[PDB]
Amino acid sequence: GVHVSYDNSIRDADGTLVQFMYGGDAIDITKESHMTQFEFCLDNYYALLKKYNPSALIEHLDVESALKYSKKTLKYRKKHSKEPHYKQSVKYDPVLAKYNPAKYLGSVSENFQDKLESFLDKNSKGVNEKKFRALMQLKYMRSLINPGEAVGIIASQSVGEPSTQMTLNTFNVTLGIPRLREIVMTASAAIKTPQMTLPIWNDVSDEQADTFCKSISKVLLSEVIDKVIVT
Amino acid sequence: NENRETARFIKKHKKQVTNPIDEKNGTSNCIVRVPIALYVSLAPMYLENPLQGVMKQHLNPLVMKYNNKVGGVVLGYEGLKILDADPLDTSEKLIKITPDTPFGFTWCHVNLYVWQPQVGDVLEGYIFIQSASHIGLLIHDAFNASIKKNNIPVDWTFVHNDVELGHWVDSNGEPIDGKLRFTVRNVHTTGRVVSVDGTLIS
Amino acid sequence: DRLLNSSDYTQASVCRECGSILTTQQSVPRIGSISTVCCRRCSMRFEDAKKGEKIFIDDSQIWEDGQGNKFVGGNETTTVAIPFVLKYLDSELSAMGIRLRYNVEPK
Amino acid sequence: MDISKPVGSEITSVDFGILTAKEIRNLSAKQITNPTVLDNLGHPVSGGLYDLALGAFLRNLCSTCGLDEKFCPGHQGHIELPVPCYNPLFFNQLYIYLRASCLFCHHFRLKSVEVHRYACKLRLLQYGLIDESYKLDEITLGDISSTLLNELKSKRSEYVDMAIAKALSDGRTTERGSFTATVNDERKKLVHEFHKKLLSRGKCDNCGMFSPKFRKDGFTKIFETALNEKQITNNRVKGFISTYILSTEVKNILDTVFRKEQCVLQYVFHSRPNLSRKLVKADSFFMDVLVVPPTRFRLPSKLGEEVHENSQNQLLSKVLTTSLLIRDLNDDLSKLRVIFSRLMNAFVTIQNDVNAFIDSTKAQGRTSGKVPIPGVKQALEKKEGLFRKHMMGKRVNYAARSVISPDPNIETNEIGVPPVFAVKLTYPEPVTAYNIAELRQAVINGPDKWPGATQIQNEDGSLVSLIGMSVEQRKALANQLLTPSSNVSTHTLNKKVYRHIKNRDVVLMNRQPTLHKASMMGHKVRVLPNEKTLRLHYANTGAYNADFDGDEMNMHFPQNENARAEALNLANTDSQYLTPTSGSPVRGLIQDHISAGVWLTSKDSF
Amino acid sequence: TTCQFLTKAVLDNEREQLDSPSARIVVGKLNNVGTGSFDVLAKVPNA
Amino acid sequence: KMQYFLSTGNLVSQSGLDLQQVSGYTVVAEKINFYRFISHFRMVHRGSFFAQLKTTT
Amino acid sequence: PEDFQQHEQIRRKTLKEKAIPKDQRATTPYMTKYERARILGTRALQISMNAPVFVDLEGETDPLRIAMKELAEKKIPLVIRRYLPDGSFEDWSVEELIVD
Amino acid sequence: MYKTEKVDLALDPITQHFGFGNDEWPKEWLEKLDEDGLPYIGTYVEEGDPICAYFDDTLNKTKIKTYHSSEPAYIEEVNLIGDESNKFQELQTVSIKYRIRRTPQIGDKFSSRHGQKGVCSRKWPTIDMPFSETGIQPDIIINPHAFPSRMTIGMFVESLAGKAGAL
Amino acid sequence: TSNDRPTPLANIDATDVEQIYPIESIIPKKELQFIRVSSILKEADKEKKLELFPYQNNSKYVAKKLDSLTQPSQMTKLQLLYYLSLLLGVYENRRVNNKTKLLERLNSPPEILVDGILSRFTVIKPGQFGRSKDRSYFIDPQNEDKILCYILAIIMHLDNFIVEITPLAHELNLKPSKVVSLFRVLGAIVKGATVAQAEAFGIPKSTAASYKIATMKVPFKL
Amino acid sequence: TATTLNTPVVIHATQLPQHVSTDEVLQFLESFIDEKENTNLSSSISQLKRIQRDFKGLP
RNA sequence: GUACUUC
DNA sequence: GTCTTCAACTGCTTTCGCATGAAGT
DNA sequence: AAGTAAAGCAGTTGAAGAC
Ligand SMILES: [Zn+2]
Ligand SMILES: [Zn+2]
Ligand SMILES: [Zn+2]
Q1: By a Cβ cutoff of 8 Å, what residues of chain I touch chain D?
Q2: For the domain that residue J43 is a member of, what is the CATH number?
Q3: Which chain C residues touch J4 with a CB distance below 8 Å?
Q4: Does this UniProt record's set of keywords contain Nucleus (chain I)?
Q5: How far apart are CA D348 and CA D544, in angstroms?
Q6: CA of G93, closest CA in chain D: separation in Å?
Q7: Pairing mode, if any, of strands D414-415 and D520-525?
C-alpha cells in the first residue's frame, strides 16, 4: 500500500508516510537515463529541445524563485566546504526541502547540480549556456515521478528480481540467501558470525595492530594445555 | 429499559402532519406539498440536460403512485434544484460520476406534491360503478375506491336492476346526486391503480 | 476487472440497521403484491407489536413469510455489489461466533 | 458484471461484532431438533439439518423464501444448547480475567486506584493524546484514609475531561476519534502489561484472603485446585474481618464482574469512542447456540462412487445426537448415582463435541486416520492460507492457456492468436449508430466464421444465443440490432453484442511463474487462420525470461474498454521497455539477428 | 493465522476503513493506489 | 485385501513395517515407451519420506 | 426530518471545509498518465452510450481512439477530482491542464 | 493414440437393455449404432454422437450415452465381457477402444538423444528452404545458435559419423 | 410425533382389509358426494364407457380394472375407479403449473375434485393474474413422493389386495426398487410370492422367491 | 421495474411538511401543463386535466 | 486422499 | 540490630504454528 | 524428521519503611 501521494510524499493506506520524498529526488528508473552524461543532451541540443518545447511552459511556472535561493544555497554551501555536518548549521535548508520539483522550475537535487557545475567547469564549447540551462532544468523537471504510482511493488520487485539469480551458496561471513533472508524477515537477533570493521590512524603500523589483535582476541583457557593427565 | 425499546417503536409510526377540517365544506384539505431529498443517478445521453434526464427517467413515471417514505400518492413536482460537490452562482455544475458505470450520482432536493389519507378522516366521492357489494367512488376522478360488505349501515339496502350495475335505496328512500360524502378506512396501492377503502359508520 | 468482473459479481441486498447480506429475507409476495424483499434481523414478532393510543399501520409494513408467521421490521434494503465468496465469508465467520456488519452510504 | 445495471451503493468501512443472547433468537426461522439429515425414500425431514426452512436442497421448493436454488440466497438457523459453552477463539483471552477476577469481592485483585489509573489513561488514549498519556501518570499529591483516594479519582476526571475538552475544541481530533499506526502500539503494550499484571503475584489488595488458582486442564474443562495449610489458616483469621467447574458458575461470575467493572471493561474491549454506548455482556464469550450455514452452501459433494454430505454435517450431527442425549438426561432426574456421572460426562462430551466442531488439534487422537475432518478453520485454511485460493485470487473466466511459438515480421506488440481461440473468447459492445456497418457484419456472420458474434442481449437483460440458429435467423436479428427500447423504463440503455475479436482491441498476457514487473504485459492481437498454437515475439521472451523448450504462458482477455485503455497506454510494451530495478533495458534480439548483424555491418560486405 | 488474528481483532472490536488493497480486494470499490486514488466529475452547461 | 493394497498403494499394516514411509509403493506403467518399461522394472527410489527433507546431502 | 437536517448540516460544513480554493492549490499542474487513462476510459464508456460528441468522426469506429482525438483538441468535458491522504479534495479542470 | 472407454449398466433384476425397445424413438442416428445398441467398426465420431444407445426398463425409452470431448476420432473394436456363473447372467459391461489422430502440428516438441530439444514453430515446405546441389531437401532445420551455451557438439560428431554411416 | 409422514393418515384398529384405510381418507365428504357415476353402469359398449372419463391416453390401464365390475353392488370399487381417471392425469403432466392449461387435456372434469388435490398435493403460488384464471400450483419432488400414495393404495382395493410388482413399475414409469420402497411407507408387507399366489398369475415356480408381490395383513403393523 | 435505473436508491424528507391551501393547485397544475406541452405519460396528462376540471368548473 | 508428469 | 510487608527475576518447558508457480491423469 | 518464537512456570529473589 505504500505509494507516492499527490503531494510528492510516499504515503501508506491509512495516511502515514515513509519518507518526505522518494529517495529525496523523486525521479523514476524509467527516466533516469542521461542525468550524469551531459555530453548527450549537449550533442543533441536541437533534437530534444524541439520535443521538450520549453516555450510552451514559460508562462506556466516560475523560474527566478528557485534559482535565486539555489544560488543562496550554493553560496552558503561553498563557503564552508571544510567540515562535515556535526558542526555546520542548516540555516539554508535545501531547495528540495521547501519546494518540491513539481511546482516551479529550478528545484533540483544536490549531486545533480554539483556534477553539473563540474561539467560546466570542464566544458569549453554554436549554442550558448542560458537556454541550455533552462533546457536541462525542464529536462530534470520532466523526469519527476508521477504522483500516484505504486512505487512499493516496484521496490519489492527491485529486491525480488535479483533473488532469482543471486541464489548461490559460496561464490568467514555469511552471504547470499542465508544472509538476505536472515536480515529481512527472520527478526534479526544475535547472529552466528557477528562482524564489525574498525579503521585505524595513519601513524599506527601493522606491526602494532597485531598486538591489539592478540589483546582483544579472546583465547580459551583450555588452549594452553598440552595434555590432561589425572591419576 | 422497558420503555427504552418502545421509544424507537413509537417514533416510526407517528404521522408527521395531520389534515384537519377546513371551511366546514364536508371534505378536508389533505393535499400537502412535502419537500424531499432525492438521491438519484444520471444518464450520459442526457448530459447536456441532467435535470431533463432525471425528469424523463426518474420523475415522469414517478407521478401518480403511492410511495413508502412520505406515505401518500404524489400529485406533481416543483422546485427542481441540483447540488454541486464543491463550493461555487454559475449555471455550469459538476456531478461525481461513478468510475464503474457511465452514470453519475447526484443528490438533489425537490419539493414534491403528495396526498395522504389518514384513518378516520372525511373525503369526497362520485359514482363510478354500482355492484351488489362494491360501489364506485372517484375522489377528484383520479383515486379509485372500494368498499366491503361490513362497512355499510344496516338501513342502506340494494335493489337489483331488470332492464340493464345495481340500484341502491337509502334509509329514507330518495336518490341523491353524484356528490357523495365519504370516510376513509384503509388504503392499498400494490395493485394496478391506487384505491382507497372507507366505511359509512362513525 | 481481473478479480471482480470475471465471475464473482452479484447484486445482493444489504440492510442499513442490520449490516448483513445473508440474513435478509426474500419473502413470498402477496396475491397482489410483487417483489417483497425485507430483513429478518431488524424485525420483531408481530405478537409483541402492541401499545398513548394504539397506533395503526399504513399496510406498507405488513407481509407474510413462507411458513405463515408474521413479524414487523426490516423495511429499507438496497442492492450492492458483493462477491459470492464474501457471501460465504460472512456466513463462515458468523458460524464461528463472530458477527459482521458493513455500512452503506448515504447514512 | 453487466454495464447495464449499476450499483446504487458503496462499501467504504466495515465493523465487526459479537452475537447477543437476544438476537440469537430472532436471526433464524426454524429450529433443528432431530439428529438426522434425511430419512429414507430420498427426501428431507421437518426440522432436519437439510431442512427446507433455511434454504432449498435438491431442487426442492424453499418453504420460507418460496423460490428455487437460483434465486433464494439462503436463510439462517441455529441449535439450542443445554449449557453455555466456551470458545477457543476467546478462551485464551477471557481466561486472563477468569484467573484474575476475585471470587468473593467480585473485583479485580488490584486496587481501584490502579484499575482506574489504567482505565483513565486508556480513557484518554483513544484520541491523539499520546502527549497527555504519560502526563496523566505523573500526578501524585495530597492502610490509609479513602477520602484522599476519592479526590484522586475526581482529579483524574477533572483532568481528562479538560484535556479531552481542549483536544476536541481546537483542531486536534474529531468526535469519531483518531487512530494512527502508533496508538495501537501503545494500546497493545498496555494490554500486554495487563496480561503481565498481578496475575503473576499473590494477595488481593481489596479483600485479603487466599483465592485458589485455576488449574488449566488444557483445551477444556478448566478445573480448580485445592489449598494448603497457610491458606486455610488465613481462612480462619478472615472471620472477624481438582474439581470441575460447571458453565453456570462462571456464567454468573463473568455476568457479575462485567456489570461491576463496566467502567474499565467498556474501553478494554473497544478501540474507538463508543458513540452508541453499547453494553457488552458475558454472553459475548459463551456460545448458547451454533448457527448453521445455509444448505445451499452445504451441498453434499460427490467424487466418483463415494456419496456423502458436507464435512460440517458430521460434527453438527454429533452435536445433534449428543444434545438430545443430554437433553433427555435431565428427564430421569425430573421424574424422581451413576446418572450424575453420566451428566457430568455429558457436559464434558457436549463440550468435546462443540469444540471439536470449532477445533481439531485438541480433541480425539484417533488412530491412523490418515486425516481428520475439517470442521471450520482448517477448511477456512487448507494449507494454512486457503484465503489465497478464493479471498485473494479467484478462478478467472475468459482465459486461454496453450503452448507458445515465436514469429518474425511483428513490430514487438502483435500477438498471433488462432481462430479456434478467437471464436470462443468474446467482448461486449453496446449498439448505436456508431457501428451500424461493422456490427451488422459481425452479427450476419455468426459464430461459424470470423469475424462473428456469439451472443446477443436485449435491453431487459435477457440472453439470446446464436449457436443454434441458422443464417435466416441471423438476418431477422441483423435487422433488429438498431431498435428503440420497449418502454421508457429502459430508454437509456441499449443492446450489447458479444463479438469475437478484432485487430484493434487489447489483450493481456502473463507468464508463470511471474516474479517481477516485466512478467505481466498486455499487447494487441493480430489473428492468423493458419494453425493451432499461440504466437509470440522475439523481444518479449527476454522480458518474460521464458524459453521454447515446452514453456507456455497465459492469454487473459479484458472485459472493459477502460482496461483496454490502461493496457494500451500503461501496460503497453513501450512503457515497460525499462525495468524499474537498475535501469537495464530488458529488450532486444538475442542471438541470430546480432550474429548476422556483425557480418552485415562489417567492412567485408558490399 | 487469520484465526488468532481474528481473536485479537474482534476482542477489541476496532473499525476498519478497508483502505489497504488487501481489504480493497475483499470488498473493493476501485483501489487506494494508482488510478483508484481519486474520483471523476462531469461539468454540464445548464443548471 | 491384497487387491486393495496394490490398488491404492498404501499398506494396512496392523503392526507396522521397518520403513518409515507408509505410502509411495506402487506405480502404473501406461506402456508408452519400452525404455520406460525396463527402467520401471529396475527403479531405485530413495523414499517419499525424504521428499520434505531440506539438506541436499 | 430534524436529524436529517443535522446530517445535512454536518456534511455541508465538512464538505466546504474539506474543499480547497483555486489559489491555495500547490500540486503538479501536469496531465498524468493515470489521469489520462482514467479520462480516456471514462470518455469511452460515456461516449459508447450515445453521448453528444464535440468533434466530427472520420469513419472512426474505436471509442479509445476517438477519446484520444478529444484529448488532442481539449474537447473532453470531464473533471479530475483529486484526493489527499488527510481526506481533502482538489478540483482539477482538464481545460487548463496541458498534456505531455 | 488410443483411448479405451467403458460403459456400464447398473454401475434386483436388470433395468437396462442393450439396444432398442418397442416404443417410438427418433430415427436418423442409425448410421452409428447397430440393432443391438452397439456401434459399427471403422466409423467417425465427434462430440455429440451416440455411442451407447440403450433401452430402459424403468422409464421404457431409449436414452443415449455419448462422447464427452472434442477429439474427432475413430473406434477400433467392441469387446464383450462377462462373469461366469452357474445360472446364466445377462452381460452388463461393455468396453470400446478409440483411435485419435495425432497429426504432427506445430506446438509439439521434438528432441534427439543428445539433450537438445525444440518446438515446431511453423510448418514450411521446400518452397523457400535452402536446397542442395545434389537434390536432397533439408526437412528439419536447427539453429547453430544453441551450441555456444547448450554445447551439444555430440550432434556435430554424430552428424559427420551419421553422414558416413549413411553415405 | 415425527409430525409428518409422506403417507396419509391410516388407522391401526380396523377389522377388515378394505377398511384398514378408509375411502374418506382419499376423497373427503365435500368431494365424494359429487361423484355422479351411477349413469355409467347402464351402458354396455366399452368404448362409450371410456370417452366420458376425465382422462384418455394411448394406453389401456384404466380399462384393465373396468373389465370385471358392472353391478351397482360394487360402487365403492367403481366410485374410485371414476376418480382413477381424474387421478393419474396430474402425474404424467406434472410439467404444467396452472389449472387452465391442465384443463385443456382433461375433458371437462369436476372442478371441486381437482381443486382439493391442489390444496393437499401441490405447492400453492398466489397471484392476482393467476387466481383470475384458476388456482395456480406447482409440484415439488416431495409431492411426487406423496402423489404415489394414492397410486399404490387404491389399486389395492381394485385388485382385491394382491398387487404385482413388475407391472406396476412398467405402467407408473418407475424403477421397481422405488415401487417396493413405497409399500413399506404405506404400511404394507412385501415378500416373495407363495406357491398359491404364483399360480394365480401364471409365472414359473423356479423364480417365485425372486418374483415378489405385494400384500397387507390385519391388524396393521404398529 | 424496481431497479437502480428507475427508482431512486435513497429518498428522505427534507423538513417539516408545510401545509398549503386548495386554490393554489389551480395555479400550479395549469402552469405545469403549459410547460409540459412544449408514451406512459399521456394518460398522466389525461388525469391531470381530469383533476383540473374539478376546482375550475363542472361537466 | 495416495501416486505420477510438464519449465 | 531484628521483625515486617511487598515488588520482581531469568531460564527451562510447552505450544501456536510455520515453509514454491502452475497443470494433467 | 526441520526451524522460529511467544506464553507459562519456578527457583531463586530477595528489596524497602517503622518501631
Ligand atoms: Zn436489516
Ligand atoms: Zn429460502
Ligand atoms: Zn479480591
Answers
A1: 2-4, 6, 123, 138, 140-142, 145, 181-182, 185
A2: 6.10.250.3390
A3: 79
A4: yes
A5: 59
A6: 21
A7: parallel
Is-contact D456 D467, C-beta < 8 A?
no
Residue G4 lies in a domain: no
Contact C79 J4 (CB under 8 A): yes
Rounded Cα–Cα distance for residues F17 and F5 (Å): 14
What is the total residue count of chain E? Answer: 47
Grid cell of A136 as nine digits? 536541462
Residue D306: its H or E element? strand D306-307
Tell me the C-alpha to C-alpha distance, in Å, between residue A105 and each of A111, A144, E37, H125: 17, 12, 27, 63
- Which domains does chain C show, CATH number per domain? 1-106 (3.90.1800.10)
Q: Which chains lie within 8 Å of chain I at 3 or more CB pairs, if any? A: C, D, H
Ligand closest in space to the Cα of C27: 2
D549 touches strand L (CB under 7 A): no
Q: Identify the burial level of G44 via C-beta atoms within 10 angstroms of its C-beta, where 0-12 means exposed, 13-18 middle and 19 or more buried.
A: buried
- CA of D252 vs chain E CAs: smallest distance (Å): 21
| CA quadruple D578, D583, D587, D593: dihedral, nearest 10 | 150
What is the Cα–Cα distance from G62 to G44, expressed in whole angstroms? 9
Residue bearing cell 378522516 = B121
Do at least 3 CB pairs under 8 Å connect I with D? yes
CATH for H66 = 2.40.50.150
- Note whether G82 and A6 are within 8 A (CB): yes
For residues F24 and F51, the answer to whether their CB atoms sit within 8 Å is no
Q: Which of I51, I42, I54 is closest to I82 using CA atoms? A: I54
In a domain, G3, yes or no: no
The alpha carbon of residue D93 and the mean position of all alpha carbons in its chain are separated, in whole angstroms, by 21
- D224 alpha carbon to ligand 3 midpoint, in Å? 17
The method recorded for this entry reads cryo-EM
Residues 6 or more apart in contact with residue D161 via CB below 8 angstroms: none
- Nearest by Cα to B108 from B36, B193, B10: B36
Helix, strand or coil for residue H74?
strand
Report how far apart, in Å, the C-alpha atoms of D192 and of each of C92, D184, D186, D188 are. Answer: 29, 12, 10, 6
- In DSSP terms, which residues pair with D579 in a beta bridge? none
Cβ contact D551 with chain L strand, < 7 A: no
Q: Which of B54, B57, B63 to mutate to test the interface with D (most CBs of D within 10 A)?
A: B57
A26-146 maps to which CATH number? 1.10.357.120
In angstroms, the separation between the Cα of residue G74 and the nearest Cα of chain E is 14
Residue in the structure block whose three cell numbers are 546441389:
H133
Taking CA D210 as the corner, what is the angle to CA D208 and CA D216, rounded to the nearest 5 degrees?
Answer: 135
Handedness of CA D223, D225, D231, D235 (dihedral sign): positive
C-alpha cell at I123: 405447492
Contact criterion met (CB below 8 Å) for I194 and I180: no
Peptide bond connecting I204 to the previous residue in cis, omega within 30 degrees of 0: no
Domain that holds residue G85: 15-100
Cα–Cα dist D134/D396, whole Å:
53
PDB resolution in Å: 4.6
J2/B contact by beta carbon, under 8 A: no
Ligand 2 center to D76 CA (angstroms): 9
Q: CA–CA separation, D326 vs D345, rounded Å? A: 9
CA distance G69 to J47: 49
Nucleotides of L under 7 A from a protein CB: 6-9, 15-22
Give every CB contact of residue D191 below 8 A, 6+ residues apart in sequence. D268
Phi, psi of B168 (to 5 degrees): -135, 145
